[PDB]
Amino acid sequence: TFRLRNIPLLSRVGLDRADELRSNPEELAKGWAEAGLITLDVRGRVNIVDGQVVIEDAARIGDQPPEHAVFLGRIPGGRHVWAVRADLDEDSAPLLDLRRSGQLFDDTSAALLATAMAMLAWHDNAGYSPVDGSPTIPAKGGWVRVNSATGQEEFPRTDPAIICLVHDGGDRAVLGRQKFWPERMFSLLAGFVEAGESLEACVAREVAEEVGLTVTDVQYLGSQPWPFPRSIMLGFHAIGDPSQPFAFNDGEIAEADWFTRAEVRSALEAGDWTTASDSRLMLPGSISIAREIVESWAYA
Amino acid sequence: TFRLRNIPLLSRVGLDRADELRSNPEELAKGWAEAGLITLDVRGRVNIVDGQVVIEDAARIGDQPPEHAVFLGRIPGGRHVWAVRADLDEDSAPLLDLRRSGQLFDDTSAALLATAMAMLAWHDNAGYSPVDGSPTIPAKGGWVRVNSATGQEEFPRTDPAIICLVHDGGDRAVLGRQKFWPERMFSLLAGFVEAGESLEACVAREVAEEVGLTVTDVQYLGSQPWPFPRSIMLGFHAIGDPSQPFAFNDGEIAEADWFTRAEVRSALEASDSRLMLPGSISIAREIVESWAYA
Ligand SMILES: NC(=O)c1ccc[n+]([C@@H]2O[C@H](COP(=O)([O-])OP(=O)(O)OC[C@H]3O[C@@H](n4cnc5c(N)ncnc54)[C@H](O)[C@@H]3O)[C@@H](O)[C@H]2O)c1
Ligand SMILES: NC(=O)c1ccc[n+]([C@@H]2O[C@H](COP(=O)([O-])OP(=O)(O)OC[C@H]3O[C@@H](n4cnc5c(N)ncnc54)[C@H](O)[C@@H]3O)[C@@H](O)[C@H]2O)c1
Ligand SMILES: [Ca+2]
Ligand SMILES: [Ca+2]
Ligand SMILES: [Ca+2]
Ligand SMILES: [Ca+2]
Ligand SMILES: [Ca+2]
Ligand SMILES: [Ca+2]
Ligand SMILES: [Ca+2]
Ligand SMILES: [Ca+2]
Ligand SMILES: [Ca+2]
Ligand SMILES: [Ca+2]
Ligand SMILES: [Ca+2]
Ligand SMILES: [Ca+2]
Ligand SMILES: [Ca+2]
């Protein structure tokens, strides 16, 4: 019935990733002369100025691009841009992380940071082949790691996960509370995609596990990179029957109920998960595609 | 604007995977008594009988379930089913691909096989932590491997990939040929999802890399598990402009062109023509077909 009103945060622009150059050490070296550089702490946090990620003049850590660096592409202009991990002084400047402060960034800076954050985290967890055990080595602007023994390439890992709004086909929708959340704190149902299933099967499965409903007419709404540490979230809605009672089998879910559009609007207008307020239902931070899905349904 | 006519092979709501039991060694052991067993060789091949997967009596390889096995869940009527990697004797009829022959199987058997095939392939490539390098060990019905040093869990890896039909908004569609394919053999454009991008951005990016078009109105069609060895394919269509010339930049693409509705229908039935299509259980075929018959 409905569509997303807004493009989810972190999806708003695609970089010029400049795929061409990744395997061209020389053109990388030529453009490093006056390239840009972005720097992340071990927490993914970064420095922000005027809503933009801080881009340092690049040739101040090297004459040539280092091995631990990751090529992110070209900004509007033509200038190469890279990311490194480095320790950052916590006390000399505010360090912003994407999950709690992504909305303060411009769209480009958010893309850069999301990419950089997921890649650097990947390298930190891919220094060895899972196949045999050999050490691995960065190559091609940091987009592969090559095995030392065999020469086999290993590639960045993004794990797909669904998030779903179950509704009755009209004016009512399922929201649920996980046991490990504060009270009065609800959202959509989510799950990782297992091997050997479609997204549509994954939605029906996870819904059935978590709240015990049978759902149909499973439909994609959109997608959002989610580097915490390495997910991509895929948004869906589906139709359930309110007359079928709930059942918490995969007991991740403490409680759940059907809510009206009215109820949800009221909850949205009182804030998100991070607001202190009176309300007996509070919903997720606008960072999440979950909030965009709920909002898109509740206002029509 | 248009939809898939059929649910892709392998994509029908599948199995009672019985997630509950995976971390309950004892209930697994109780049900092994007269469980079922499915067996896959190193090439992913399997045996068929009467349109169904071969399910052997399970207890004939041990008293208890082995560690290299993988629990697949319960068939209709509480009965556990497991998968193991083993050699096959080949005095039965063994399907070299499920990829080329999965159409012979009932939906359930195809789900079982798809799950089994992706899991077993995963174990074979996940015997070590990528973090530190330690050995890893099966656990929980084969659904995790635990690190030997640190105790940290590693989980099955399914890599998401897009596959896209670019069309002009009317009667013409892009198909492309990879280098070292037979001539006159074209298909959809595909690419892996990189870190930090949406599916919609991934489609536009991969299309631009491979054939040099700028595309808009990117729309999801459906999805299909693709254990060859470890993908999930996400089907899309998008609008491009035929007046913009092609360009093979990253160009694993040898050649490409726009084809008419008519040309595609003819190719689907198909030698003779300038365009033939590969014969697969792939969602690619279902996408092309669904566009061509409006
Ligand atoms: N409202 C929400 O619930 C909400 C909001 C924003 C983001 N998310 C995201 O939903 C995603 C999916 O996770 P979830 O919260 O539904 O499940 P979960 O994290 O609550 O628990 C599922 C568990 O399955 C295991 N697992 C299974 N397969 C895995 C895999 N392939 N890769 C990594 N771990 C795997 C992990 O231990 C995981 O914790 C998470 O990344 C979460 O950040 C959810
Ligand atoms: N029409 C088709 O070509 C068609 C049809 C059905 C299925 N598929 C499947 O789509 C998937 C990806 O397609 P592609 O190979 O054209 O994508 P692509 O354009 O990203 O090619 C990248 C190449 O580099 C490697 N690579 C890059 N990222 C990888 C990753 N994240 N995981 C594993 N390898 C990676 C692979 O070896 C691949 O051959 C594959 O499973 C492929 O078999 C394609
Ligand atoms: Ca390019
Ligand atoms: Ca401090
Ligand atoms: Ca879950
Ligand atoms: Ca799950
Ligand atoms: Ca679950
Ligand atoms: Ca009620
Ligand atoms: Ca269950
Ligand atoms: Ca044999
Ligand atoms: Ca034999
Ligand atoms: Ca490709
Ligand atoms: Ca690519
Ligand atoms: Ca490519
Ligand atoms: Ca032509």
XYZ file of C-alpha atoms in Angstrom, chain A residues 119-275:
157
model
C 36.221 -1.267 5.587
C 38.644 -0.449 8.417
C 36.694 -2.696 10.768
C 36.904 -5.454 8.116
C 40.699 -5.226 7.780
C 40.946 -5.409 11.581
C 39.058 -8.753 11.373
C 40.554 -10.219 8.181
C 44.308 -10.483 8.772
C 44.130 -14.275 8.266
C 42.511 -16.600 5.718
C 39.483 -18.460 7.174
C 40.272 -21.148 4.612
C 43.754 -22.307 5.681
C 45.003 -19.796 8.321
C 47.729 -17.920 6.426
C 48.420 -14.196 7.118
C 46.793 -11.890 4.503
C 48.046 -8.584 3.029
C 46.164 -5.428 1.864
C 46.112 -4.736 -1.882
C 44.374 -2.653 -4.550
C 43.689 0.503 -2.530
C 42.686 -1.678 0.442
C 39.765 -3.387 -1.336
C 41.176 -6.917 -1.107
C 43.486 -8.805 1.188
C 45.708 -11.365 -0.568
C 46.680 -14.650 1.107
C 50.461 -14.992 1.665
C 50.822 -18.712 0.901
C 48.299 -19.248 -1.933
C 47.694 -15.775 -3.464
C 43.905 -16.156 -3.027
C 41.913 -12.915 -2.599
C 39.603 -12.294 0.373
C 36.872 -9.635 0.132
C 34.913 -7.321 2.519
C 31.973 -8.969 4.305
C 28.527 -7.320 4.496
C 25.906 -9.441 6.335
C 22.292 -8.927 5.108
C 19.461 -8.524 7.634
C 15.733 -7.856 7.247
C 13.524 -5.466 9.196
C 9.765 -5.715 8.784
C 6.580 -3.801 9.635
C 3.663 -6.237 9.929
C 0.301 -4.524 9.350
C -3.313 -5.673 8.956
C -3.765 -4.173 5.463
C -5.498 -1.102 6.932
C -4.906 0.956 10.067
C -3.061 -1.364 12.524
C 0.593 -2.429 12.846
C 2.699 -4.780 14.987
C 5.481 -3.376 17.134
C 7.504 -5.373 19.637
C 9.758 -4.949 22.666
C 12.918 -6.998 23.203
C 13.618 -8.221 26.744
C 17.010 -6.454 26.769
C 15.543 -3.000 25.989
C 14.192 -0.471 28.547
C 10.415 -0.588 29.015
C 7.976 1.401 26.838
C 10.499 0.916 24.018
C 9.263 -0.743 20.816
C 10.284 -1.238 17.212
C 9.901 -3.458 14.158
C 10.926 -7.121 13.936
C 14.374 -7.864 12.546
C 16.570 -10.854 11.746
C 19.715 -11.937 9.927
C 19.317 -13.760 6.619
C 20.401 -17.386 6.965
C 22.030 -19.412 4.175
C 19.603 -21.183 1.833
C 16.660 -18.783 2.191
C 15.231 -15.878 0.215
C 14.621 -12.483 1.842
C 10.877 -13.201 1.624
C 11.302 -16.518 3.464
C 13.600 -14.833 5.991
C 10.910 -12.233 6.779
C 8.141 -14.853 7.192
C 10.484 -17.027 9.290
C 11.703 -14.276 11.635
C 8.177 -12.873 12.093
C 6.939 -16.386 12.969
C 9.816 -16.980 15.403
C 9.587 -13.679 17.252
C 5.808 -13.083 17.596
C 4.175 -16.219 16.132
C 2.254 -14.611 13.260
C 1.880 -16.011 9.747
C 2.437 -13.208 7.217
C 1.871 -12.737 3.468
C 2.447 -10.127 0.728
C 6.038 -9.461 1.822
C 7.253 -6.319 0.023
C 10.578 -4.464 -0.131
C 10.606 -0.784 0.878
C 14.334 0.028 0.773
C 17.839 -0.558 2.122
C 20.448 1.073 4.348
C 24.180 0.384 5.017
C 24.543 -0.472 8.722
C 28.255 -0.730 9.718
C 27.797 -1.685 13.359
C 29.928 -3.504 12.557
C 29.078 -4.929 9.130
C 25.357 -5.184 8.255
C 23.065 -4.017 5.496
C 19.442 -3.581 6.566
C 16.682 -4.440 4.094
C 13.274 -2.949 4.839
C 9.993 -4.780 4.252
C 6.301 -4.641 5.119
C 3.961 -7.646 5.337
C 0.313 -8.438 6.069
C -0.738 -10.336 9.192
C -4.085 -11.234 10.762
C -4.957 -9.627 14.149
C -7.342 -12.483 15.022
C -4.391 -14.922 15.218
C -2.994 -14.632 18.805
C 0.628 -13.750 19.582
C 3.223 -16.317 20.730
C 6.795 -15.636 21.869
C 8.649 -18.824 20.812
C 12.041 -17.396 19.943
C 11.750 -15.451 23.187
C 13.691 -12.389 22.080
C 10.385 -10.496 22.343
C 9.068 -9.590 25.822
C 5.814 -8.026 24.589
C 4.060 -6.773 21.460
C 0.671 -5.546 20.263
C -1.136 -3.986 17.308
C -1.138 -0.163 17.310
C -3.207 2.372 15.351
C -1.769 4.948 12.976
C -2.957 7.579 15.488
C -1.106 5.891 18.378
C 2.084 5.682 16.304
C 2.007 9.334 15.179
C 1.619 10.372 18.836
C 4.604 8.187 19.765
C 6.726 9.532 16.880
C 5.916 13.155 17.805
C 7.073 12.488 21.407
C 10.539 11.547 20.057
C 12.789 8.491 19.717
C 14.693 5.963 21.872
C 16.967 8.705 23.251
C 14.257 11.200 24.427
